[PDB]
Structures are given as C-alpha cells and as structure tokens.
Design a protein around this ligand. Sequence first.
Ligand SMILES: CS(=O)(=O)Cc1nc2ccccc2[nH]1
Ligand SMILES: [Zn+2]
Ligand SMILES: [Zn+2]
Ligand SMILES: [Zn+2]
Length: 459
Amino acid sequence: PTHLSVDTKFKTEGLCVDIPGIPKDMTYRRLISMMGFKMNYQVNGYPNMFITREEAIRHVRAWIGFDVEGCHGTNLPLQLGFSTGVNLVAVPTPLMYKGLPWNVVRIKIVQMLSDTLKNLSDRVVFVLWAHGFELTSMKYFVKIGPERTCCLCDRRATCFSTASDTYACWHHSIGFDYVYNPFMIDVQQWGFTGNLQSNHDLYCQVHGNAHVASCDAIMTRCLAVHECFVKRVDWTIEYPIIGDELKINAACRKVQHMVVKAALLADKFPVLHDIGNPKAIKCVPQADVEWKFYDAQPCSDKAYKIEELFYSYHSDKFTDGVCLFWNCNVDRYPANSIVCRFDTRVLSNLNLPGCDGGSLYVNKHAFHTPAFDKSAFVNLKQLPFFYYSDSPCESHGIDYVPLKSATCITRCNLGGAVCRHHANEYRLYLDAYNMMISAGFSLWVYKQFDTYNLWNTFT
Ligand SMILES: CS(=O)(=O)Cc1nc2ccccc2[nH]1
Ligand SMILES: [Zn+2]
Ligand SMILES: [Zn+2]
Ligand SMILES: [Zn+2]
C-alpha cells in the first residue's frame, strides 16, 4: 500500500443530486472512467488521480480547494471556485469573473495554479467535497498521461500545451492550457455526517458561506486542514526545503540565545521557567540561573489557558524569576515573561492559510498555529532590537565601513569606537533578526526590560 488503489470503493451517495442514478457500488477505476479519463493500463508513476489521506498530508503545500456549482451540466453555465478566492464562469456555448468559454477558462486555471503553487509544490491536490459537477468538469481542463519532466527544466510536468504539444512545470507554463496529471481527494470519503457548512462551521468562524463556489472551496480546504493538522497531529512527517527554512531556524536560535542571555544579565533573575516544547535545551548554558523545564506541545486548536498551564498545584510560584515562552502560544502572558509568538497573519511561502484564523506553518514539520491575538501581550511590551556581546574585541581572519549604532552593546561601543569583529557580528545578527521578524515571528518582553542595564556588565 504505497498509493490509493483504483479498485478501492468510492461512496457515491454525495453525488446523486448532480448525478442521479449513480450506482452505489463504485470503485476509483470506474469513477475515473465515468469522468472521461482513460488510464490505458499505464505503469508510469501516476497510478490513480485520487490519493490517500496520508499522501494528501505529505503534500499539503499543494492543496487547492475546488468546487463547481451549476449556475443554471454541459448545457448550463458553471461557476468554478478555488480556495485562492477566484470564481471563473464557464459557458458551454471572492473574485466573481463573468461567463467565458472553456478554451479561455483553462488558460486562466493554468496561470492561477502555477502562480500560486510554483514556490510551494511540484503538484496540485484539488481538495473536494464532491457533489458531481466538479468531477465531470475536469475533462474540460485536465489531461492525464505518464509521469513527465518539464520541457525547459527537470521538475515534474504539471502543465501541458495543445498549441505547442509540450509539457511544463509550474514555473515554465506561461501560455499553457491544460492541467497535466493533477491529484485530488474527496473529503466526503472521510465519513462526515451532515453538509459541508455544518461540519466546517463546527470549528471555524472566519470563513463565511455566501453561496459562491469559492466560499465552498475555502471551507473544504479549511475543513481538510482541521482534520489533518488541528485535531490530528503527525510530527513524524518531514517536508522538503522550499525557501529560507535553514536561515529562519538558524536565526531563531541566535535570537533566543541573545535575548535570554541579556535578560539574565540585565535583571539577574534567580530562576527561569522554561515553558514549552518537551525536547528543549538551555539556550544560555553558561547562565547562573536555575533552569526549570515544563513540557507543553505546540497547540494547534486553541491557545493554552495560562490558568491550566500553571494553576492546580514545578516552582508553583511562577511569579518568582522569569518565564520563557519560546513559541509556546498562551491566551495571556504573565508580566514576568520573555515571549516569541509566531504571527499567523504573515504572508510567506512557509505559511499556508489555516482553520479559525490560525495558519499552517510548514518548516521541516507542519505546525498549525492558533490565530495571533494582540491581547495576549497586554502585560508585556515589544522587544526592541539590540546586539549584546561580552566576547573579546579581536578580529581574527570581508571588507569594512565604520559601524555607528546605539544598539550595539559592546565594550568597544562603550569605549567610543566599535571594533571590526563586533561590527561584523552586529550586522550578521541584525540580518538573522530581520530574517526571523519577516518570517512572521514576534518578540515580547516584560515592561521593566531595559538595555541600559547591559552596559554595567563591562568594568
Ligand atoms: C488522455 S485523457 O487526458 O484521458 C483525454 C484527453 N486527451 C487530451 C489531449 C489533449 C488535451 C486534453 C486531452 N484530454
Ligand atoms: Zn520547468
Ligand atoms: Zn474555515
Ligand atoms: Zn569590540
């Protein structure tokens, strides 16, 4: 069992209002055939158009919700909706486009999926809540064949052109008209009771139904994300590198060491309550502080209630010392805290839209994070940038232009002139900091934190 078998049963009950008379006994093999696609007995990397829930999870970056509503069935016009917010109307002859024929519609579909997916995936997985018209309309914009490579590169073929009889990946498809070898999954096969909106609305108040096809496409992908990443968490699935994953993570470790090392020198707390990830290490191992760890896994549903994390009888007195919440999302942080909270609103290739305002951050692993809430930080202030260093002023070993900056907290800057070594480190750390901030991370600290207190650690 590597893939989904074509001889697997397909529950057709969700299809008999668009397709009345549909046989109850149905397989994926018969379904694909009914849809207008001939598989020719090809053993060439595309065993089935439909995929498993496990394969859908491994390729979540490729998910695009898809819904088709009959505006009036090859006689009446159709409204095609995608989780990108696009609405295309096809005539057989939230971006609501007017009625145009299929030969122009398929060109817009290729453009759209390619621009959306080229920096996320090698494929498209159409997430469906199948009623009938979406499966029957695929023959109008989808070509299937053996697995292929791009005509201009080595990435797998995701598009095909009838004008030039060639195949292309998502990056080299300009002008292409057919969606080559797509993937799909039907959420109704996962055994839900009730209609799409009832099931979606049980866990999400952000996506509202309007009746347009794109609203259903959005609710479908959202519901599929909740099922596979909110109420089900598989932290063993690793995801490929598609951006600055290595630098974002490397930057977060440098910023964590820096921010925590300085908080301990500035306010000399006797104890540090490290709340979060059960696999954590002391980010500042040479600190005098008493480091006490408390296990808490990345919540995907709702943010942790600080009342359930602490209270119920551990230092018990968390108000003693400082609390470190590094990516441990709570409802309202205590005033004596240092916090790194990922901002779910951030626009990036690593951040995919999620469920109930949350987002699915995929970087080595998929972490669905609850919606960013500015009110969680009422007892804290934003952490200002600063570079602190106690290291000796010695160059060892890249050209130089004098560094002038107040936020470079070093012995040389105290003594009136930054050395080359610390100026290199300041700019390197400033880029690691800028990297993490733009990736969506936000830093918060107790109101009494003052960098002026770091200068007296040089005597
Ligand atoms: C082989 S198939 O995908 O099942 C049917 C088909 N054959 C095509 C040739 C050109 C364009 C679209 C086409 N759809
Ligand atoms: Zn290519
Ligand atoms: Zn939703
Ligand atoms: Zn120096």
